[PDB]
């Protein structure tokens, strides 16, 4: 067989230990999911420094907590805009997930609160910036560098899926790099509790699984497809399926054809053909062996999964960092004042926040 006795025993034991970890983690998650945290700070506790990113509902700002001097990333959402854009459930769900999960590669929610106008989620500040920026700048990541990041996503999805959470928005734009060079997954706006199937068309065109495009009921396997897209894009510098317009991207995704750069190793191409598998009965992460088909693949043979989890592996890349409030790994955005109104705008809708 592929393993002698010692290696087979060690692998079996490791896999049973994962099961034991996940059972405890699910019990802890369910306690917090049923009793969420609320109203742990207020706006005048922080100085607002600089906008780090923007979205349709609001912005993320670097803030400094006055009493402690600690920096955080504050997501500000305008309640009226959230309602106008039909995002009430997603916004409440994102906060509920963030306060209930706990994993070393998932960004932590440190405080949350609301006022007349806005919702506020104060998260750890992740100072290395977006993987997207580093990838476009460097061009591509070497296979060991891509693998280091991929391993963190594998573990994070193994965790989330054990909780029956599907993530649904993996892409470099949503992965931040911390001061030690490890990933922080951000943005749970599309994540959903799904033990069976779900049907919403959501995600980003290049990262959509075929079954989403084809309007089928789908499951956690869409995240394993997206991992394939991510690994490909990290290692190539461009994603496997692209075109001028989304419809042409979708035709390529559903085709069952994918082409690889000549510098991809055979092990990498094998992994990617098994992740980017249109046929759900054949896609890695969706078979009887579950996540183990991925973790035990030859491309990951050098990966020490526990060492990655414990953050004891030396990162391939440490972002530039001048000090606690350095924002040099984020872009510059036009700044706009935050206006709190005498509207209790949309109080009923956001009672649970």
């Amino acid at each position: 067989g592929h393993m002698g006795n010692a290696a087979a025993a060690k692998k079996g034991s490791e896999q049973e230990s994962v099961k034991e970890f996940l059972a405890k983690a699910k019990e802890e998650f369910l306690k917090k999911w049923e009793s969420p945290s609320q109203n742990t700070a207020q706006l005048d506790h922080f100085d607002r420094i600089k906008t780090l990113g923007t979205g349709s509902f609001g912005r993320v700002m670097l803030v400094k907590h006055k009493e402690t001097g600690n920096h955080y990333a504050m997501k500000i959402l305008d309640k009226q805009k959230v309602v106008k854009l039909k995002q009430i459930e997603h916004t409440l769900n994102e906060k509920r997930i963030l306060q209930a999960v706990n994993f070393p590669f998932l960004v932590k929610l440190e405080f949350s609160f609301k006022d007349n106008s806005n919702l506020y989620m104060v998260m750890e500040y992740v100072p290395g910036g977006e993987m997207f920026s580093h990838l476009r700048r460097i061009g591509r990541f070497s296979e060991p560098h891509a693998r280091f990041y991929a391993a963190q996503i594998v573990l994070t999805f193994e965790y989330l899926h054990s909780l029956d959470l599907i993530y649904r928005d993996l892409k470099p734009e949503n992965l931040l790099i911390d001061q030690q060079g490890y990933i922080q997954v951000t943005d749970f706006g599309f994540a959903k509790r799904v033990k069976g199937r779900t049907w919403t068309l959501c995600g980003t065109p290049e990262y959509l699984a075929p079954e989403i495009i084809l309007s089928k009921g789908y499951n956690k396997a869409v995240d394993w497809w997206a991992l394939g897209v991510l690994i490909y894009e990290m290692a190539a510098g461009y994603p496997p399926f692209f075109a001028d317009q989304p419809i042409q991207i979708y035709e390529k995704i559903v085709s069952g054809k994918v082409r690889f750069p000549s510098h991809f190793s055979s092990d990498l191409k094998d992994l990617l053909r098994n992740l980017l598998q249109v046929d759900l009965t054949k896609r890695f992460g969706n078979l009887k062996n579950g996540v183990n088909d991925i973790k035990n693949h030859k491309w990951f043979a050098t990966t020490d999964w526990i060492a990655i989890y414990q953050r004891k592996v030396e990162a391939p890349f440490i972002p530039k960092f001048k000090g606690p409030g350095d924002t040099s790994n984020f872009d510059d955005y036009e700044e706009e004042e935050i206006r709190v109104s005498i509207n209790e705008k949309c109080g009923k809708e956001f009672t649970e926040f």
Binding site: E173, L201, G203, T204, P205, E206, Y238, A243, D244, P261
Partner: peptide, 19 residues
């Protein structure tokens, strides 16, 4: 080349979700 085709797509910047 494939890279040139990627540049030609115009989708080299940050990509929005469908929402």
């Amino acid at each position: 080349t494939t890279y040139a085709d990627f540049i030609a797509s115009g989708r080299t910047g940050r990509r929005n979700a469908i929402h």
